[PDB]
């Protein structure tokens, strides 16, 4: 048969080392797991400890301002899992701030994302289109994946998350070309 | 679209015979 040379969420060629940390979900001060970096990123966790609280946590990237174009495509792929059921759901998030943030602003926009959730394992390979021009001058737009729950269950989580911004495209070897 | 460099593997033969296999061979 022929190869499908067409896919969603082309992944970065290098990944960050596996780490472990403890976070507390928040509604108005949702923490960020890592320092945001330009365009794509991919990270994995050995043990992510979540305390009992209400709110969300997010993995965030910084939008590239070059190649002026308001509408751009953002993609995500993540296989988060654990030993118990933590009763959470996920969606994309957009927010902006004037400085490098360690948390998420109280006001943000959510974008629906369709994945799979059997018991406590979440897998998704979706993508969406998000505006990139800031609403207030002098700010930087941030996009990422947020895990939200109305009542978290104390436990530990492990998996891998990858985010990409489609500002350019990647070429691959096609033997018939 | 491409005649000379797609048809044949060498040039025209104007010279002495090169191959002798014992008779006609097609």
């Amino acid at each position: 048969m022929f190869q499908e040379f067409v896919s969603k969420h082309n992944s970065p060629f290098t990944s960050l080392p596996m780490v472990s940390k403890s976070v507390t979900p928040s509604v108005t001060a949702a923490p960020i797991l890592s320092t945001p970096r330009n365009q794509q990123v991919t990270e994995s966790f050995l043990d992510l400890t979540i305390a009992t609280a209400a709110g969300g946590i997010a993995s965030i990237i910084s939008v590239d301002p070059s190649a002026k174009a308001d509408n751009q495509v953002f993609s995500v792929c993540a296989h988060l899992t654990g030993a118990a059921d933590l009763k959470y759901w996920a969606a994309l998030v957009r927010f902006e701030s004037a400085t490098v943030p360690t948390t998420v602003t109280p006001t943000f926009d959510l974008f629906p994302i369709a994945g799979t959730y059997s018991n406590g394992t979440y897998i998704v390979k979706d993508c969406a289109t998000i505006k990139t021009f800031p609403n207030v001058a002098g700010n930087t737009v941030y996009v990422g994946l947020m895990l939200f729950s109305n009542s978290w269950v104390a436990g530990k989580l492990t998996g891998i998350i990858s985010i990409n911004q489609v500002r350019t495209e990647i070429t691959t070897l096609q033997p018939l070309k | 679209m491409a005649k000379s460099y797609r048809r044949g593997s060498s040039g025209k033969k104007k010279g002495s015979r090169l191959w002798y296999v014992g008779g006609s061979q097609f």
């Binding site: 040379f5 067409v6 096609q174 018939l176 070309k177 | 679209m1 797609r6 048809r7 008779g23």
Partner: protein, 54 residues
């Protein structure tokens, strides 16, 4: 056998050595053209087809 007789300057009929008689031979080269892909994946690749009348 017919080569040995030919070296002496003689000739043999096709009934002498019981060989088939050749009537005609034709030789030609086959060419064609190319077709271009126009979708997202195959924009830039080509496929060749050979069609020659004789």
């Amino acid at each position: 056998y017919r080569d040995v007789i030919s070296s002496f300057g003689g000739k043999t009929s096709y009934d002498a050595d019981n060989r088939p008689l050749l009537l005609m031979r034709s030789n030609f080269w086959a060419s064609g053209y190319d077709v271009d892909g126009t979708d997202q994946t195959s924009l830039g690749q080509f496929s060749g087809r050979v069609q020659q009348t004789f």
